[PDB]
RNA sequence: AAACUCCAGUUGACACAAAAUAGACUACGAAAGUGGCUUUAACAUAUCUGAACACACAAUAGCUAAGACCCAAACUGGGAUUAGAUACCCCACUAUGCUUAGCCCUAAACCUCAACAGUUAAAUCAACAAAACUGCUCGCCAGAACACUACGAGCCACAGCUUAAAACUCAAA
């Protein structure tokens, strides 16, 4: 998070803000503001770090960064409010909307898609091909079918050496 | 509108709930037996797999769990 | 943000009332608050009897403290006021002067059809 | 009638219950819901559509555990009524309604109006509801009853929920 002494986004570029009294600096800092003001500073930090034009807020990159800041705020909210179903819905919807943005950015501008992933620390994931419950019967059977495959592979390798050994003896 | 269709459904559901109430001990014995057969049918399906793959016994360390018991 | 503390103090003599205000403003400062003003609204009869700290009150000293503080200071200050025996009732609200009133052109008529329709 | 008679009235102290008036308002939220006060956090998406099952929710009732308990209150008990009264009427009291942590996943969950976009000119239009329609997409339906059922499968559900037939029968519904 930005330091609490950080000035608000509105008062950072006023001339003479560095020569005012310390009390005036406290009143124009993040310490004396609500959390939404800290999120505006975070968004601007990511914009300058990632996007080519930090002032283009309608680009697909800026929307991903803006929504990524909202997503992080919901996660912090839900860390303290674990039964807040309203904000849990907002988080899951926001993650889905960003994935749609990342999908559309990956298809149109891959170089920018890579910088967004590195800058925001997003590991893009491709969606599953099928949506179907993995119930107990399927989970148990799939595990058995993998064990059976693993055992068959071992037996097939012990039928390569014995055949190899016998062939050498003939010579 | 009239509620004559709801009334037909109402009586059907009342009589069903009452029927289940009267026979809840027989139905519990029947349900227990079905779950046993369901478990046996499941164990056979897994045994078919390793047997059709050439193995003679279950994979080393494999125990088929009871996936239908209340526990 | 900017807050307004509406403080009702136990009716006391001037020395004990000043000691309570100083002790209350220092608690705000200890929690990071920047105190802007202190207003005396006068001692008056309470609108109803208030029981606080095993005592019944019919009169109190009404004071206001305008101050800026971090959002985390409110929760801690409310707890401090609950333990001060000389405070009858203390409430911290967002300062009303921060909220800017939006301009109003007037009372637009509402169609009666919507009333019954709605 | 029963019940109470450490009862009732005034005064004072006094809650983990419930939130007159405002509200003749029609707001917030995806819906369910949300109407005492304060504060903090906070109400996704710069094209739409997109799931019985994926993901996350979902009134009331109900389950498991630990608490609170004013009042209300299934059940139960008592009083009365009645041909009978397992009711309606009166009294008492419990589960329950509350909190905490888990479940359960239903509703006449209904504006009984699917989402989005567009039109008010055509014929205005079976009827009633709520003026009549177009584009586009998903979901769903194909006589009644059997059937919010049977069997299968899934599920913390085990007297449950979801999905959901057939045979016999009728000329209606
Ligand atoms: K109220
Ligand atoms: K309705
Ligand atoms: Mg029937
Ligand atoms: Mg959609
Ligand atoms: Mg759906
Ligand atoms: Mg489907
Ligand atoms: Mg359903
Ligand atoms: Mg529910
Ligand atoms: Mg409950
Ligand atoms: Mg009572
Ligand atoms: Mg009786
Ligand atoms: Mg009780
Ligand atoms: Mg309460
Ligand atoms: Mg409703
Ligand atoms: Mg739809
Ligand atoms: Mg049919
Ligand atoms: Mg049902
Ligand atoms: Mg069923
Ligand atoms: Mg079944």
From Swiss-Prot, chain A:
- One Gene Ontology CC term in the entry: mitochondrion
For this entry, the protein name equals Small ribosomal subunit protein uS15m
Q: Which gene encodes it?
A: MRPS15
Where mainly located?
A: mitochondrion
List the GO biological process terms.
mitochondrial translation; translation
- Please give the family membership noted in the entry: Belongs to the universal ribosomal protein uS15 family.
Q: How does it assemble?
A: Component of the mitochondrial small ribosomal subunit (mt-SSU). Mature mammalian 55S mitochondrial ribosomes consist of a small (28S) and a large (39S) subunit. The 28S small subunit contains a 12S ribosomal RNA (12S mt-rRNA) and 30 different proteins. The 39S large subunit contains a 16S rRNA (16S mt-rRNA), a copy of mitochondrial valine transfer RNA (mt-tRNA(Val)), which plays an integral structural role, and 52 different proteins. Interacts with METTL17.
GO MF terms held by the record: RNA binding; structural constituent of ribosome
UniProtKB/Swiss-Prot annotation, chain B:
The opening ranks of the lineage are: Eukaryota, Metazoa, Chordata, Craniata, Vertebrata
The task this protein performs is described as: May act as a negative regulator of Aurora-A kinase, by down-regulation through proteasome-dependent degradation.
| Tissue localization of expression | Ubiquitously expressed and especially highly expressed in heart, skeletal muscle and testis.
Organism equals Homo sapiens
Intracellular or extracellular location(s): Mitochondrion matrix; Nucleus
| Protein's recorded name | Small ribosomal subunit protein mS38
Q: Which family does it belong to?
A: Belongs to the mitochondrion-specific ribosomal protein mS38 family.
Task: Note the superkingdom of the native organism.
Answer: Eukaryota
Subunit structure, per the record? Component of the mitochondrial small ribosomal subunit (mt-SSU). Mature mammalian 55S mitochondrial ribosomes consist of a small (28S) and a large (39S) subunit. The 28S small subunit contains a 12S ribosomal RNA (12S mt-rRNA) and 30 different proteins. The 39S large subunit contains a 16S rRNA (16S mt-rRNA), a copy of mitochondrial valine transfer RNA (mt-tRNA(Val)), which plays an integral structural role, and 52 different proteins. Interacts with Aurora-A.
Swiss-Prot record, chain C:
UniProt keyword annotation of Cell cycle present? no
Q: How does it associate, per the subunit comment?
A: Component of the mitochondrial small ribosomal subunit (mt-SSU). Mature mammalian 55S mitochondrial ribosomes consist of a small (28S) and a large (39S) subunit. The 28S small subunit contains a 12S ribosomal RNA (12S mt-rRNA) and 30 different proteins. The 39S large subunit contains a 16S rRNA (16S mt-rRNA), a copy of mitochondrial valine transfer RNA (mt-tRNA(Val)), which plays an integral structural role, and 52 different proteins.
The answer, when asked if Ribonucleoprotein is one of the entry's keywords, is: yes
Any single GO CC term annotated in Swiss-Prot or TrEMBL for this entry: mitochondrial inner membrane
Q: Name one Pfam family in it.
A: Ribosomal_S6
Q: What InterPro entries does the annotation carry? A: Ribosomal_bS6 (IPR000529), Ribosomal_bS6_sf (IPR035980), Transl_elong_EF1B/ribsomal_bS6 (IPR014717)
PANTHER family hit by this protein: MITOCHONDRIAL 28S RIBOSOMAL PROTEIN S6, SMALL RIBOSOMAL SUBUNIT PROTEIN BS6M
- What name does UniProt use for this protein? Small ribosomal subunit protein bS6m
**Its family?**
Belongs to the bacterial ribosomal protein bS6 family.
Query: One GO BP annotation here?
Result: translation
Task: Enumerate the subcellular locations listed in this protein's record, separating them with semicolons.
Answer: Mitochondrion
A single GO molecular function, which one?
A: small ribosomal subunit rRNA binding
Keyword field: Mitochondrion, Ribonucleoprotein, Ribosomal protein
Protein encoded by which gene: MRPS6
């Amino acid at each position: 998070d930005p330091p609490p002494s950080t000035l608000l986004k509105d008062y950072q570029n006023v001339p003479g803000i560095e020569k005012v009294d310390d009390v005036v600096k406290r009143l124009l800092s993040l310490e004396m503001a609500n959390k939404k003001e800290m999120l505006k500073i975070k968004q601007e930090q990511f914009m300058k770090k990632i996007v080519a034009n930090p002032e283009d807020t309608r680009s697909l990159e800026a929307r991903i960064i803006a929504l990524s800041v909202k997503i992080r705020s919901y996660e912090e909210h839900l860390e303290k409010h674990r039964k807040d179903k309203a904000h849990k819905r907002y988080l899951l919807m926001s993650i889905d909307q960003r994935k749609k943005m990342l999908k559309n950015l990956r298809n149109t501008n891959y170089d920018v898609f890579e910088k967004i992933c590195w800058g925001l620390g997003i590991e893009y994931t491709f969606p599953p091909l099928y949506y179907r419950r993995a119930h107990r019967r399927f989970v148990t059977k799939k595990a058995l079918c993998i064990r059976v495959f693993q055992e068959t592979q071992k037996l097939k390798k012990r039928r390569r050496a014995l055949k190899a050994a016998a062939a050498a003896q003939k010579q | 509108k009239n509620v004559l269709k709801i009334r037909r459904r109402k009586m059907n559901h009342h009589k069903y709930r009452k029927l289940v109430k009267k026979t809840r001990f027989l139905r519990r014995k029947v349900q227990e037996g079905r779950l046993r057969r369901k478990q046996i049918k499941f164990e056979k399906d897994l045994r078919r797999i390793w047997l059709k793959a050439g193995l003679k016994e279950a994979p080393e360390g494999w125990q088929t769990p009871k996936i239908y018991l209340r526990g | 943000p900017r807050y307004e503390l509406a403080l009702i103090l136990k009716a006391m003599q001037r020395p004990e009332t000043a000691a309570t205000l100083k002790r209350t403003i220092e608690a705000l400062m200890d929690r990071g608050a920047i105190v802007r003003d202190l207003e005396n609204l006068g001692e008056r009869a309470l609108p109803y009897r208030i029981s606080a700290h095993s005592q019944q009150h019919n009169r109190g000293g009404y004071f206001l403290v305008d101050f800026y503080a971090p959002t985390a200071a409110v929760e801690s200050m409310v707890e401090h006021l609950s333990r001060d025996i000389d405070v009858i009732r203390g409430n911290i609200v967002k300062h009303p002067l921060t909220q800017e009133l939006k301009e109003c052109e007037g009372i637009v008529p509402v169609p009666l059809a919507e009333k019954l329709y709605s």
